[PDB]
């Protein structure tokens, strides 16, 4: 939900690191034209852990949101954006006709269709060089077949289903030898006392009965193992509740 959305030719990298993704308000916002997610599933996205997350923003027509796929080329998929074949993420696109598509025309929205070669995957090429679509050189001036690489969408509220403004938010999840920094693991049930119960604190598991706080833990401590190498004093990770096992 970003006003003045980033267009397709100048998609901004919004790298997410040292944050905890939720993957819930993403799905519960706006009627999505296409919630396709190749490589990874959005249902298990909250359970999967990734090292780094990139987010990119496109504004393209409804006939152009299907072009965003690995191994696919077109008006947008060859010169505006390219996808690496090891992509793990989603290709979520909106149907934003109310926010964009001014009656005077959203001529600020354009797309690139001139390039001397195919776009490299995960590469941005923002240039204002006059494209030599013909044989004669341009030399700055628009010669015989020298034109700007940009073409206007002219978004207005008279267009069709496949030609309305379409806001595409694509998420890229990358994992490597570094530890995962973006996850969604926030889930914690309420606790009980004086009951034979299995417990799982911060990954470490066990069973037994519980007792409230009585000892003198340090300002920083979480583990209260005794001489007998047995877990007997633990802290609640969400609220400062010292327990005895």
């Amino acid at each position: 939900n970003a006003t003045t959305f980033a267009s397709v030719y100048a998609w901004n990298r919004k790298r997410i690191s040292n944050c905890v993704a939720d993957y819930s308000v993403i799905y519960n916002f706006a009627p999505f034209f296409a919630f396709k997610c190749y490589g990874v599933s959005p249902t298990k996205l909250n359970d999967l852990c990734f090292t780094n997350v990139y987010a990119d923003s496109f504004v393209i027509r409804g006939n152009e949101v299907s072009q965003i796929a690995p191994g696919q080329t077109g008006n947008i998929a060859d010169y505006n954006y390219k996808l690496p074949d090891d992509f793990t993420g989603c290709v979520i696109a909106w149907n934003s006709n109310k926010l964009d598509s001014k009656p005077s025309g959203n001529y600020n929205y354009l797309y690139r269709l001139f390039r001397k070669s195919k776009l490299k995957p995960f590469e941005r090429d923002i240039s204002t060089e006059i494209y030599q679509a013909g044989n004669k050189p341009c030399n700055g001036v628009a010669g015989p077949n020298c034109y700007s690489p940009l073409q206007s969408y002219g978004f207005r509220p008279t267009y069709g289903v496949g030609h309305q403004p379409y806001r595409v938010v694509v998420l890229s999840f990358e994992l490597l030898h570094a530890p995962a920094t973006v996850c969604g693991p926030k889930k914690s049930t309420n606790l009980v006392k004086n009951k034979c119960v299995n417990f799982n604190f911060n990954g470490l598991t066990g069973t037994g009965v519980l007792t409230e706080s009585n000892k003198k833990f340090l300002p920083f401590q979480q583990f209260g193992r005794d001489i007998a190498d047995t877990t007997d004093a633990v802290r609640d990770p969400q609220t400062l509740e010292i327990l005895d096992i």
């Epitope: 027509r61 080329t73 013909g134 044989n135 034109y147 073409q151 002219g154 267009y159 069709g160 030609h163």
Partner: antibody, heavy 117, light 107 residues
Framework: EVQLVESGGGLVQPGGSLRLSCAVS????????MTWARQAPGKGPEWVSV???????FYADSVKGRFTISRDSSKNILYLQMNSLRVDDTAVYYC???????????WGQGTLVTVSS | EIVMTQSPATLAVSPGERATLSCRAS??????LAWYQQKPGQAPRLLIY???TRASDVPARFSGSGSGTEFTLTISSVQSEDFAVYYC??????????FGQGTKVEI
């Protein structure tokens, strides 16, 4: 000016193969979209195949899987190889540099491609 | 894809008179319609692109109007050279477009 000269057309039996050349004078075929347009004697024209400078080639619904569109940048010649021809492929073939978004257009003279047995 | 109909298909206007043609689309595109002129035995020549602007070395008589699923092409004064065939190409998904069927204008 832009001049497009089509050659290689003629009478070819259905189920055979043919190759058409399109000499282009005015620009480079590796930097322009070349449309290989058809026109019926009774009906109007249609789009059949398109090509991109990056190597992206597209075909129509009734012509896909049979045709090959190629470019010669040194010779500046657009080539079209057609295989498994049918009776419906008897038309007049043009090389079309439509480019109608900006507002300049150039169309070739074309050749009468006749497919019959 | 989007197809079109041309009304009327039996157009016949005398020389030196205003001429009217209408194109009705099947679906809605991004207001990208091209009026093309083809003479008998000739390559088609573009007149109007986007249904609002004339082409290079094209006289000011031809004018386009309308947006959406109905478009109107108006010729101010046909003088012995504009009697030809007109197509309303729909380049809303350009370069994937569709040309017309035939609008032979008779004297």
């Amino acid at each position: 000016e832009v001049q497009l000269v089509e050659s290689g057309g003629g009478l070819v039996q259905p189920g055979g193969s043919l190759r058409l050349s399109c000499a282009v004078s005015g620009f480079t075929v590796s930097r322009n979209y070349m449309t290989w347009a058809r026109q019926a004697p009774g009906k109007g024209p249609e789009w059949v195949s398109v090509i991109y400078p990056g190597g992206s080639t597209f075909y129509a619904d009734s012509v896909k899987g049979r045709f090959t569109i190629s470019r010669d940048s040194s010779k500046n010649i657009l080539y079209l190889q057609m295989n498994s021809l049918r009776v419906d492929d008897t038309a007049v073939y043009y090389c079309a540099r439509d480019l109608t978004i900006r507002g300049e257009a150039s169309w070739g003279q074309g050749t009468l491609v006749t497919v019959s047995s | 894809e989007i197809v079109m109909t041309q009304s009327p298909a039996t157009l016949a206007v005398s020389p030196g008179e205003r001429a009217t043609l209408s194109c009705r689309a099947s679906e809605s595109f991004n207001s990208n319609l091209a009026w093309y002129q083809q003479k008998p035995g000739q390559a088609p020549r573009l007149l109007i692109y986007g249904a609002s602007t004339r082409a290079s070395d094209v006289p000011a008589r031809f004018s386009g109007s309308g947006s959406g699923t109905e478009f109107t092409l108006t010729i101010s004064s046909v003088q012995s050279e504009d009697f030809a065939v007109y197509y309303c190409q729909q380049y809303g998904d350009w370069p994937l477009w569709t040309f017309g069927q035939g609008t032979k204008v008779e004297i």
